[PDB]
């Protein structure tokens, strides 16, 4: 629809180009100037034109040591290494490499690993023509033949085999989303006859570019173009949609320029004639071929930078591609920027111990960038459900019906289009509100990796990139060590608690950035690790090296500076600047998203240390990891000895303090005073006192005062939070307990939060007992919503769940009769509830889908929920304040309240009536019993105040759907399984149905036909 502005008057012999790049690309090419791999770079100007840039003359290489013989110091054998062996038996050694310009170069460099000296050594630099020839050469120089005139006897290892685009960016100092400049007279626009579809197309040599480091005025962001879209399909009853039978009926698109607070384009393409919508364009077609063609032409002409959505990768784009393949439309799958290239669906998997394992499809688009917001949420955030409704409530606050809204009239289709446009608008709001893209651009500028790697890869490519960028400045080469496999080492210490309930303030002192500052201030690195022999026979121990608790020796900083101290120092300053910016916000959600930014930079700095100990990886050095955790243990026991030893009764102070807890970075010391001001004063004195026994940047700091405190086990405690004194209290802290885990029911987590509220804030155990009694009583009397009963568990890799029978695996692998095409896959979460049956050996035989127990009305196992979900967390919490008469107090609270329980063949009812007063079954329909007949005015009085309260609950719920829907004049259709509103509006109809019929036992209060 709307086009980019027109590039007026660029003349290359006088004017430069200044543009900001988004994507890079590799390309094997003809039309050479009179190398074959030429590079592509796509970007945008400071105004809004689209620029493609072709870069020429770059070829991959690596290094290898020159062996000590008469060969690789003699030029005849250098060019003979270039020369091929013409023998017949060298077909395995000069064919797959063959005649390639590997070349011969002599340079003086060093290896990374260890500390041998300040002296370098000769290495050979071996270029290669193509990037897809470094793999057979590696298969032909190490295990292949290297008998060539006795120049290089096998073997010499390969060093610095890295990726092509990463080697380019390490070479020329270009980072992700960078400002690039072509100077005047260096670039030719009309040398390249147009093979792509951008406006400006330059054709430059790889030594002409200028990279501007992002800082000062070069810290801006260009006006990018962002698209979001959503589709609709018309299915059958029960049957989930399939790309060979179910047509695509509506596509809806939103588009904006980045930096402007509203969109500028709003389009909706439908398949029958429709009705107009104010604010958007509407076009209609009588066939699906025209609809797919129209969308492909719009996406070529608008030419967006970024494409977003929600689950567009695994649902939307391959559905469109398969549907275009079935209907024989040849011109659809050309969505990219290159004019002669069609797109294809390709599977990929990712797995780690940090995010688990996920299997995704990818679809190829060259030039353009994809950001599915579902994958960003699934990677960064740990939530309970990952539906669009659930995250839109958590962050903002909100198939067979559609097939008859489309086979109807045109106002129904207009309603369908407004629904689809709201769906297509929600991920834009989430992208701009959560500060996604600004943090992605800052991550790519601090680490130096492209913008497509932050959605596909892990935390290794970034630390490899930063280490290579720091390695070119002193002249070192990296080695290739690979081992399967070493052993584990010893991790962190935890101090033994003094368990219980405390009501005198405890002050928390901890170290900030512990492991990066250990690695900084004792000069630990790959490049300064001293081997056990190379100290000998030199004898200089003092101020030349140090010794660690695991046992290594490491050189002092008066000889070398390591590489990991400098990378860590850069990351630490970036996080410090993020916190300094975060210290001046007032909005809460903005404060937590800047907390998210600084959390991400601290995770990056700690993954630098975790790179060293990963024995399945790219470069492990477990000696360093052992030295780190040994220093950690030594320093925390130093802290505990010092804190408990100095402030004592004989040293003039009030009370000898005693440490109650410590977990590898923090110390919770109990001081003795019950005044929060005096505890805060002595705690600040203690933190600042103890910090002066270390190198720098090692510092201990005061952080909080808990008052009161509740310590249950290791990694399980709770307390109340004081930041200042006249800032009285902030909130609770629930470390580890049953309120922050997601393996349980909402009922149990709510009861634990409410019990700690009534028990820590108001200090009333009697209201707490009465609360827990009411929860158990309302459980047994069958008046608890089934939202509070849903359990969710993650469906991981299928073989570990083959090894032992679980409940959620049994529910998932059991398909439905309605739909063998929508079922949980690997990596998602399965929700279930437990119904009552008589198979007590197996709780995996009583699990059912919440919607299935909704539509089929199966009962609930209240004894399962009473003794297996609720009871034992309560016995954790309520015991330490009292004795074991407290277990008997809650099991007796239960006992006064356990005696109140509410209740094929089911069709053959008799429906025996019963007396309302004393429950005696009898013949006739009158409500009262003959012995309890007098007391009837009181028994009518009783239960009409129950009908009165059910009437008041019907009306508050069924008009809330009208305000959440938007309209007051049309029907509600919302079966949202993540809304408490749904199925709480279903049971009050039946309560009212039952309670209205019980009062017609009594006669009518008058006539009605008068």
């Amino acid at each position: 629809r709307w086009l980019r502005p027109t590039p007026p008057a660029l003349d290359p012999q006088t004017e430069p180009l200044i543009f900001q790049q988004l994507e890079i690309d590799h390309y094997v090419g003809p039309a050479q100037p009179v190398s074959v791999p030429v590079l592509r770079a796509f970007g945008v100007t400071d105004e809004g034109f689209s620029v493609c840039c072709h870069i020429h003359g770059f070829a991959p290489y690596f290094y290898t040591p020159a062996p000590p013989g008469f060969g690789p110091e003699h030029m005849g054998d250098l060019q003979r290494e270039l020369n091929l062996a013409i023998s017949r038996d060298s077909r395995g050694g000069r064919e797959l490499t063959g005649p390639a310009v590997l070349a011969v170069e002599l340079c003086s460099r060093e290896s990374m690993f260890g500390y041998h000296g300040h002296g370098p050594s000769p290495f050979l630099r071996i270029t290669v023509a193509l990037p897809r020839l470094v793999a057979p050469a590696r298969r032909l120089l190490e295990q292949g033949i290297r008998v060539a005139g006795l120049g290089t006897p096998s073997f010499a290892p390969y060093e610095a085999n890295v990726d092509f685009e990463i080697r380019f960016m390490v070479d020329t100092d270009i980072v992700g989303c960078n400002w690039l400049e072509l100077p005047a007279g260096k670039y030719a626009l009309r040398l390249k006859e147009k093979a792509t579809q951008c406006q400006l197309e330059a054709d430059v040599l790889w030594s002409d570019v200028v990279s501007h480091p992002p800082e000062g005025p070069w810290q801006r962001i260009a006006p990018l173009r962002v698209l979001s879209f959503d589709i609709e399909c018309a299915g059958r009853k029960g049957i989930f949609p399939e790309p060979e039978r179910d047509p695509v009926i509506q596509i809806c698109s939103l588009g904006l320029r980045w930096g402007e607070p509203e969109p500028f384009l709003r389009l909706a393409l439908t398949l029958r004639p429709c009705a107009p919508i104010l604010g958007a364009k509407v076009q209609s077609y009588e066939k699906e071929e025209d609809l797919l063609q129209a969308w492909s032409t719009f996406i070529r002409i608008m030419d967006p930078d970024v494409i977003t959505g929600y689950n567009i990768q695994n649902f939307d784009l391959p559905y469109l591609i398969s549907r275009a393949q079935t209907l024989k439309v040849q011109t659809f799958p050309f969505l990219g920027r290159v004019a002669g290239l069609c797109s294809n669906i390709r599977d990929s998997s990712f797995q780690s111990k940090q995010t688990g394992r996920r299997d995704t499809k990818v679809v190829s688009m060259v030039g353009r960038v994809q950001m599915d917001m579902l994958q960003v949420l699934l990677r960064e955030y740990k939530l309970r459900s990952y539906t669009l409704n659930a995250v839109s409530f958590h962050f903002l606050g909100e198939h067979s019906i559609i097939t008859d809204l489309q086979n109807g009239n045109d106002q129904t289709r207009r309603r369908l289009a407004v629904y689809c446009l709201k769906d297509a608008y929600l991920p834009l709001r989430l992208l701009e509100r959560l500060m996604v893209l600004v943090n992605a651009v800052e991550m790519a500028r601090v680490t130096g990796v492209p913008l497509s790697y932050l959605l596909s890869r892990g935390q290794q490519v970034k630390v490899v990139s930063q280490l290579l960028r720091q390695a070119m400045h002193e002249g070192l080469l990296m080695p290739v060590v690979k081992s399967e496999g070493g052993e584990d080492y010893t991790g962190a210490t935890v101090i033994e608690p003094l368990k219980g309930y405390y009501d005198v303030p405890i002050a928390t002192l901890d170290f900030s950035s512990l492991y990066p500052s250990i690695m900084m201030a004792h000069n630990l690195c790959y490049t300064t690790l001293l081997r056990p022999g190379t100290a000998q026979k030199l004898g200089l121990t003092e101020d030349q090296f140090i010794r660690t608790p695991t046992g290594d020796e490491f050189v002092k900083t008066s000889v070398r500076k390591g590489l990991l101290p400098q990378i860590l120092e850069n990351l630490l300053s970036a996080r410090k600047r993020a916190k300094a910016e975060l210290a001046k916000e007032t909005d809460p959600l903005r404060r937590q998203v800047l907390d998210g930014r600084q959390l991400a930079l601290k995770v990056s700095a700690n993954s630098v240390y975790g790179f060293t100990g990963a024995q399945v990886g790219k470069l492990p050095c477990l000696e360093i990891s052992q030295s780190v955790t040994g220093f950690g243990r030594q320093m925390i026991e130093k802290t505990k000895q010092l804190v408990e030893s100095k402030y004592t009764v004989e040293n003039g102070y009030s009370t000898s303090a005693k440490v109650v807890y410590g977990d590898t970075d923090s110390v919770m010391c109990r001081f003795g005073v019950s005044s929060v001001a005096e505890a805060m004063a002595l705690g600040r004195e203690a933190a600042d006192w103890v910090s002066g026994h270390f190198p720098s940047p090692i510092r201990l700091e005061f952080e909080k005062v808990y008052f009161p405190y509740l310590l249950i086990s290791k990694k399980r405690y709770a307390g109340l939070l004081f930041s200042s004194r006249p800032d009285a209290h902030d909130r609770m802290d629930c470390k580890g307990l049953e309120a922050v885990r997601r393996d349980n029911c909402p009922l149990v987590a709510n009861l634990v939060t409410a019990s700690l509220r009534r028990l820590l804030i108001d200090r009333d155990p009697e209201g707490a007992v009465a609360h827990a009694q009411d929860v158990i009583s309302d459980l047994l009397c069958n008046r608890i919503d089934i939202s509070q009963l849903v359990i969710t568990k993650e469906l991981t890799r299928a073989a570990s769940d083959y090894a032992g029978k679980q409940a959620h695996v049994e529910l998932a692998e059991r398909m439905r009769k309605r739909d063998p095409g929508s079922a949980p896959s690997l990596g998602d979460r399965v929700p279930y509830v437990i119904i009552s049956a008589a198979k007590g050996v197996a709780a995996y035989m009583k699990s059912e889908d919440p919607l299935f127990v909704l539509e089929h009305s199966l009962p609930i196992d209240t004894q399962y929920y009473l003794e297996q979900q609720l009871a034992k967390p309560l016995l954790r919490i309520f015991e330490p304040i009292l004795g074991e008469g407290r277990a008997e107090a809650v099991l007796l609270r239960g006992d006064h309240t356990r005696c109140k329980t509410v209740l094929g063949l089911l069709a053959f009812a008799k429906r025996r009536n019963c007396c309302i007063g004393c429950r005696t079954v009898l013949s006739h329909q009158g409500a009262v019993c003959e012995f309890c007949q007098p007391r009837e005015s009181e028994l009518y009085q009783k239960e009409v105040s129950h009908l009165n309260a059910l009437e008041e609950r019907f009306s508050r719920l069924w008009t809330q759907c009208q305000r959440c829907q938007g309209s007051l004049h049309e029907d509600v259709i919302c079966t949202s399984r993540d809304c408490p509103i749904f199925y709480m509006r279903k049971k009050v109809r039946k309560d009212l149905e039952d309670q209205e019929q019980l009062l017609r036992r009594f006669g009518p209060p008058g006539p009605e036909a008068w």
Binding site: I401, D404, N407, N409, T412, E855, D971, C974
Partner: protein, 66 residues
Amino acid sequence: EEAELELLRQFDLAWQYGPCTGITRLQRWCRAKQMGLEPPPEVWQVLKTHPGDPRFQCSLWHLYPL
């Protein structure tokens, strides 16, 4: 039949007769006739040549827990 099942499905979604997914089909036909909006005399003449069948004398979504 199979042509009489689309006439009723077309009467059920025309907005000028009312917002009807809680009641029967013949009750909505007589409600519009009282106010006399314009009920057509064909959605009546198939609700008379049938008995109490639940796929003629019921709204489209008379399943569906809404």
